């Protein structure tokens, strides 16, 4: 569905801008798809304002697609994506961890399994250490060990936690040769620079675009298996200016403006970065409000307005090296009683 693709990209750029506001000079890494999917999963249980605030925050137009069609779109996307080859590995999972005695509507658990692939695991949250182990183990298994501590603190009164994870591992079509990796300057700013391992490729034809009006250069590196990485390289001191132009429209212009061009040398750092976030402030700014207050209506979960969101956390890791790229992320939505 082209609608789902568009909403997910609009959400990605909106999230990105707010993540940067937190700390505008820090590395950023996140999975917008993981967050979109987790919140769409939550909305399966939401009604009324709580529901329309979630779906609108995710950048869907309810006037052009119904709730039923949004969930069917996620189901379809989840089925299309889950992929495994000696070429490329891609896994996404959803789960709910629920207080054992909490009575859930059959329609919710049926829907959650059918549409989002979600099991329901009985969890004793009053044994906080055991409950965190169960959730963190699920995410570690799903991300093949790359994310192990998504949950640090967990209220012992928690009623449920909805979890999404994504795992990605892929080889470059044109891999770098480790013999051509050498320590080189990386300019944190015009005046501050450090030495990093810098990979290099010589004489390569790849898609290329120089955006003079935005002062940036764009290249695409393919993975084997129909994923790719789009790299955007602002001119020095122009990263803030490029960030101010990002949008679905600009990304489209980037892709469409790419042309194959022979490149004499490409230099790219070998690097590994991780970030973790609490997303409450951002979701609130993005208009997802009632879910956090005693007005919350998550009565599609239980048959009463007796649940509200307490904490939304996200963790993501990105490893880029000569042969390819690994990246993982997870999102958890922690829910208390009301």
């Amino acid at each position: 569905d082209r609608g789902l693709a568009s909403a997910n990209v609009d959400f990605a750029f909106s999230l990105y801008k707010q993540l940067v506001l937190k700390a505008p000079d820090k590395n950023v890494i996140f999975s917008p798809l993981s967050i979109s999917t987790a919140l769409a999963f939550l909305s399966l249980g939401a009604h009324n304002t709580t529901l329309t605030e979630i779906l609108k925050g995710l950048k869907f137009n309810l006037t052009e697609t119904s709730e039923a069609e949004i969930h069917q779109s996620f189901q379809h996307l989840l089925r299309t994506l889950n992929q495994s080859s000696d070429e490329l590995q891609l896994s996404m999972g959803n789960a709910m961890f629920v207080k054992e005695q909490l009575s859930l509507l059959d329609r919710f658990t049926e829907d959650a399994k059918r549409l989002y692939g979600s099991e329901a695991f009985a969890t004793d949250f009053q044994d906080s250490a055991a409950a965190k182990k169960l959730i963190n183990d699920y995410v570690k298994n799903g991300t093949r060990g790359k994310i192990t501590d998504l949950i640090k603190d967990l209220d012992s009164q928690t009623m449920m936690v909805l979890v999404n994870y994504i795992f990605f591992k892929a080889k470059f079509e044109m891999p770098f040769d480790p013999q051509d990796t050498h320590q080189s300057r990386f300019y944190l700013s015009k005046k501050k620079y450090v030495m990093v391992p810098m990979m290099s490729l010589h004489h390569l034809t790849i898609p290329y675009f120089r955006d003079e009006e935005l002062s940036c250069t764009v290249v695409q590196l393919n993975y084997t298996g129909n994923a790719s990485a789009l790299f955007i390289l602002p001119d020095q001191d122009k990263m803030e200016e490029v960030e101010a132009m990002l949008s679905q429209e600009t990304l489209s212009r980037f892709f469409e403006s790419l042309e194959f061009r022979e490149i004499g040398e490409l230099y790219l750092p070998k690097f590994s970065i991780s970030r973790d976030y609490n997303l409450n402030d951002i979701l609130l700014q993005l208009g997802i409000e009632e879910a956090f207050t005693s007005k919350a209506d998550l009565s599609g979960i239980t048959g009463a307005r007796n649940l509200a969101v307490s904490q939304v956390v996200h963790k993501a890791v990105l490893d880029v090296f000569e042969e390819g790229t690994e990246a993982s992320a997870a999102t958890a939505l922690e829910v208390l009683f009301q």
């Binding site: 590395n27 300057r185 040398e265 990105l318």
Partner: protein
């Protein structure tokens, strides 16, 4: 003769070529470990 040198902050967007899903988005302002 064109050179592309990622020796300053850059963006990286990992996408599914068929569904146009953005799996991951990243700004690298300091890659050093």
């Amino acid at each position: 003769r064109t050179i592309v040198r990622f020796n300053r902050p850059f963006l990286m967007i990992i996408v599914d070529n068929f569904t146009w899903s953005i799996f991951f988005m990243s700004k690298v302002t300091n890659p050093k470990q």
